[PDB]
């Protein structure tokens, strides 16, 4: 589904300001999609399957082995992220993608059990921490792309004007 970079296009791009790409035959690229659709106290995220399909197909076609996890608390998300960061395939990888899709608030991403009374939130800060050089040494010097589909609060994010 992705337009291909031709040999003359890759040569045109290639100098020392580009992340090195590993040999196609030996590399083990990994990506993770966490998507919450069903919640304890928030309406079902209908249409999430369309998102899961599109992102999985795209990332696979970009060369990534894609793992999909569904309907998790912030704690389970944390465990999953910890397991993902420790995967030995990252050592023979050149990059990674992390996709989070859920309800969201200003504080962060909503776990399946989130409520205004009892918060269940994965912070953006925690995501970075779990994938940094200390906790994920295998991705040191390698691009880590984090994609988030969620609200960052409940404001429509607009201002009105006459003129």
């Amino acid at each position: 589904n992705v337009k291909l970079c031709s040999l003359e296009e890759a040569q045109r791009i290639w100098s020392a300001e580009i992340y090195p790409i590993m040999d196609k035959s030996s590399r083990t690229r990994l990506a993770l999609i966490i998507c919450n659709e069903e919640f304890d106290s928030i309406p079902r995220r209908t249409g999430a399957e369309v998102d899961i399909t599109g992102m999985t197909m795209l990332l696979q076609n970009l060369g990534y082995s894609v793992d999909v996890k569904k309907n998790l608390t912030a704690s389970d998300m944390t465990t999953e992220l910890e397991a993902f960061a420790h995967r030995p395939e990252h050592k023979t990888s050149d990059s990674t993608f992390l996709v989070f899709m859920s309800h969201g608030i200003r504080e962060g991403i909503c776990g399946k059990k989130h409520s205004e009374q009892v918060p269940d939130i994965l912070q953006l800060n925690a995501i970075f921490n779990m994938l940094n050089t200390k906790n994920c040494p295998s991705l040191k010097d390698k691009p880590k792309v984090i994609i988030i589909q969620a609200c960052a609060g409940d404001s429509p994010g607009v201002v009105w004007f006459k003129d």
Binding site: K3, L4, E9, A10, A48, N132, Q149, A152, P156
Partner: protein, 87 residues
């Protein structure tokens, strides 16, 4: 022992600005995700991810209907990240 940066080579791309809503059609999917796939499909061949993400942001420029503005956050990419699709 040797020193290394604790945080480097990160990029985050969020569906909306802080405080603000992101939109999702009940059958068509999330607008940001749909827009992201389409731009990655078209531009991964010729643009680095930062450039692709800027192009996604441009597509939301006009605040028509259900307005939102995707944001790039906490960027420590020291080089350009080209996907080199096909390679």
């Amino acid at each position: 022992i040797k020193k290394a940066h604790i945080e480097k080579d990160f990029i985050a791309f969020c569906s909306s600005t802080p405080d603000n809503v992101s939109w999702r059609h009940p059958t068509m999917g999330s607008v940001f995700i749909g827009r992201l796939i389409e731009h990655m499909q078209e531009y991964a061949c010729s643009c680095d991810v930062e450039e692709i993400f800027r192009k996604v942001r441009f597509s939301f420029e006009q605040p028509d209907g259900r307005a939102q503005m995707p944001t790039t956050a906490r960027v420590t990419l020291t080089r350009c990240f080209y996907l080199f699709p096909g390679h």
